[PDB]
Design an enzyme around this catalytic site. Structure first.
Site, mmCIF file in Angstrom:
data_model
loop_
_atom_site.group_PDB
_atom_site.id
_atom_site.type_symbol
_atom_site.label_atom_id
_atom_site.label_comp_id
_atom_site.label_asym_id
_atom_site.label_seq_id
_atom_site.Cartn_x
_atom_site.Cartn_y
_atom_site.Cartn_z
ATOM 1 N N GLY A 1 0.815 -1.197 0.000
ATOM 2 C CA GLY A 1 0.000 0.000 0.000
ATOM 3 C C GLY A 1 0.851 1.249 0.000
ATOM 4 N N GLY B 1 0.880 5.014 2.177
ATOM 5 C CA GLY B 1 0.366 5.922 3.178
ATOM 6 C C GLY B 1 0.564 7.375 2.790
ATOM 7 N N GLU B 2 0.315 8.261 3.745
ATOM 8 C CA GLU B 2 0.448 9.686 3.513
ATOM 9 C C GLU B 2 1.902 10.146 3.497
ATOM 10 O OE1 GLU B 2 -2.097 11.598 6.369
ATOM 11 O OE2 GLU B 2 -3.959 11.228 5.300
ATOM 12 N N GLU C 1 5.247 4.215 2.323
ATOM 13 C CA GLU C 1 4.712 2.936 1.892
ATOM 14 C C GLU C 1 4.149 2.160 3.074
ATOM 15 O OE1 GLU C 1 8.559 1.531 0.419
ATOM 16 O OE2 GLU C 1 7.899 1.926 -1.635
ATOM 17 N N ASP D 1 -12.926 6.731 12.860
ATOM 18 C CA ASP D 1 -13.080 6.090 11.556
ATOM 19 C C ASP D 1 -13.287 4.588 11.687
ATOM 20 O OD1 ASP D 1 -13.439 5.942 8.790
ATOM 21 O OD2 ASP D 1 -11.290 5.746 8.403
ATOM 22 N N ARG E 1 -13.310 -1.972 6.989
ATOM 23 C CA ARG E 1 -12.012 -1.855 6.314
ATOM 24 C C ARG E 1 -10.867 -1.536 7.274
ATOM 25 N NH1 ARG E 1 -12.086 3.752 6.454
ATOM 26 N NH2 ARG E 1 -14.224 4.552 6.266
ATOM 27 N N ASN E 2 -11.169 -1.042 8.480
ATOM 28 C CA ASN E 2 -10.145 -0.744 9.473
ATOM 29 C C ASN E 2 -10.014 -1.828 10.533
ATOM 30 O OD1 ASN E 2 -8.814 1.599 8.633
ATOM 31 N ND2 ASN E 2 -10.508 2.901 9.361
ATOM 32 N N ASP F 1 -6.386 1.447 12.408
ATOM 33 C CA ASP F 1 -6.765 2.682 11.728
ATOM 34 C C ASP F 1 -5.765 2.900 10.606
ATOM 35 O OD1 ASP F 1 -7.518 5.164 10.816
ATOM 36 O OD2 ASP F 1 -7.432 6.134 12.783
HETATM 37 C C1 DWT Z 1 1.891 -0.752 10.163
HETATM 38 C C2 DWT Z 1 0.768 -0.194 10.863
HETATM 39 C C3 DWT Z 1 0.854 1.050 11.505
HETATM 40 C C4 DWT Z 1 -0.255 1.593 12.187
HETATM 41 C C5 DWT Z 1 -1.475 0.906 12.229
HETATM 42 C C6 DWT Z 1 -2.619 1.365 12.924
HETATM 43 O O1 DWT Z 1 -3.642 0.683 12.876
HETATM 44 N N1 DWT Z 1 -2.476 2.478 13.698
HETATM 45 C C7 DWT Z 1 -3.459 2.973 14.520
HETATM 46 C C8 DWT Z 1 -3.459 4.348 14.720
HETATM 47 C C9 DWT Z 1 -4.412 4.930 15.568
HETATM 48 C C10 DWT Z 1 -5.348 4.128 16.232
HETATM 49 C C11 DWT Z 1 -5.366 2.742 16.083
HETATM 50 C C12 DWT Z 1 -6.339 1.912 16.757
HETATM 51 F F1 DWT Z 1 -6.886 2.602 17.687
HETATM 52 F F2 DWT Z 1 -5.775 1.010 17.166
HETATM 53 F F3 DWT Z 1 -7.074 1.624 15.959
HETATM 54 C C13 DWT Z 1 -4.401 2.182 15.215
HETATM 55 C C14 DWT Z 1 -1.546 -0.332 11.590
HETATM 56 C C15 DWT Z 1 -0.455 -0.873 10.915
HETATM 57 N N2 DWT Z 1 -0.517 -2.071 10.303
HETATM 58 C C16 DWT Z 1 -1.086 -2.300 9.095
HETATM 59 N N3 DWT Z 1 -1.317 -3.572 8.774
HETATM 60 C C17 DWT Z 1 -1.864 -3.900 7.602
HETATM 61 C C18 DWT Z 1 -2.091 -5.236 7.299
HETATM 62 C C19 DWT Z 1 -2.614 -5.597 6.058
HETATM 63 C C20 DWT Z 1 -2.848 -6.948 5.794
HETATM 64 C C21 DWT Z 1 -2.585 -7.915 6.766
HETATM 65 N N4 DWT Z 1 -2.064 -7.555 8.012
HETATM 66 C C22 DWT Z 1 -1.839 -6.202 8.268
HETATM 67 N N5 DWT Z 1 -2.199 -2.938 6.741
HETATM 68 C C23 DWT Z 1 -1.976 -1.657 7.065
HETATM 69 N N6 DWT Z 1 -2.224 -0.542 6.383
HETATM 70 N N7 DWT Z 1 -1.873 0.429 7.072
HETATM 71 C C24 DWT Z 1 -1.998 1.837 6.633
HETATM 72 C C25 DWT Z 1 -1.372 0.008 8.229
HETATM 73 C C26 DWT Z 1 -1.433 -1.322 8.240
#
Ligand code: DWT
Length: 262
Positions: free
Chosen positions: A16, A18-19, A22, A134, A138-139, A152
């Site tokens: 993917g 991000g802002e 990657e 949000d 999808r989140n 998120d």
């Molecule tokens: C690397 C990473 C950094 C931050 C977050 C994230 O959810 N941050 C966040 C920020 C504020 C609040 C929250 C929460 F409150 F938890 F929701 C979470 C997730 C991740 N992990 C991710 N995993 C995955 C992913 C995709 C497929 C299988 N396993 C994980 N995709 C992601 N896309 N993005 C933009 C982040 C992804």
């Protein structure tokens, strides 16, 4: 946030954008532990010192959360470039696409278990006064055991957002409850888009008519009633997350009550 030495990190595929950079799948192999898969957000190149800060603020926020239904921060890479945020990797990816691929292949009790996990994660966030803003299928990431973890991914999410948050930007845990009701509908509909292909203006218009999304096929009436409770215009009348978890636990305890459908 735990500092991870970059020598323990390998990047295997860009999944993917991000802002600030990657999103990647990778592997983490620390000295004492076994190697695991990780998801990685990257920030590299000529970013300002401010952007780096804004990028790393996300990890400071995430690092507060420790709950089985909240995505787990593994740590950060900050002593080298690229700067990185690492989380666990979830085998089944995002909930909405997972359910669409597996349409009809989960029982009501399995779907209720996913909904209960999501509600428990949200109860934890609300308890520490964190407003998600949000919440949407999808989140939400799904592991190999169907455990759902609130995440998120950043970005307009009109159709998941409570009316008072659309109109006046009044984002609270009660507006998160509205979003949770939408997530319930997404789950019971195996990943249908909320309000189908209605435009955003059509959605606002429908809500103003007091219309609410209908029970998805095979959805127990008691689950749809809980959705309606989450979608009250009066934010103070919506159930709070502990009340949602309690309501789902009653259905799990009394599964016959899940047999009553429209
Ligand atoms: C690397 C990473 C950094 C931050 C977050 C994230 O959810 N941050 C966040 C920020 C504020 C609040 C929250 C929460 F409150 F938890 F929701 C979470 C997730 C991740 N992990 C991710 N995993 C995955 C992913 C995709 C497929 C299988 N396993 C994980 N995709 C992601 N896309 N993005 C933009 C982040 C992804």
């Amino acid at each position: 946030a735990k500092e991870i030495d970059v020598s323990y990190v390998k990047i295997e595929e860009v999944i993917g954008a991000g802002e600030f950079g990657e999103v990647c799948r990778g592997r983490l192999k620390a000295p004492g532990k076994k190697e695991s898969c990780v998801a990685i957000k990257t920030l590299k190149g000529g970013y300002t010192e401010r952007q780096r800060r804004e990028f790393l603020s996300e990890a400071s926020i995430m690092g507060q959360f420790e709950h089985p239904n909240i995505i787990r921060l593994e740590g950060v890479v900050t002593n080298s470039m690229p700067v990185m945020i690492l989380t666990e990797f979830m085998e089944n990816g995002a909930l909405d696409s997972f359910l669409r691929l597996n349409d009809g292949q989960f029982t009501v009790i399995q779907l209720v278990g996913m909904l209960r996990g999501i509600a428990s994660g949200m109860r934890y966030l609300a308890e520490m006064s964190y407003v998600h803003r949000d919440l949407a299928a999808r989140n939400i990431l799904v592991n190999s055991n169907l455990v759902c973890k609130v995440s998120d991914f950043g970005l307009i999410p009109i159709r998941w957002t409570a009316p008072e948050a659309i109109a006046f930007r009044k984002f609270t845990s009660a507006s998160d409850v509205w979003s949770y009701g939408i997530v319930m509908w997404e789950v019971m509909s195996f990943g249908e888009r909320p309000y189908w292909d209605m435009s955003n203006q059509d959605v606002i218009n429908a809500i103003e008519q007091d219309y609410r999304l209908p029970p998805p096929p095979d959805c127990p009436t008691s689950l749809h009633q809980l959705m309606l409770d989450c979608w009250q215009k009066d934010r103070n009348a919506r159930p709070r997350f502990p009340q949602i978890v309690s309501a789902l636990d009653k259905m799990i305890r009394n599964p016959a009550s899940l047999k009553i459908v429209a």
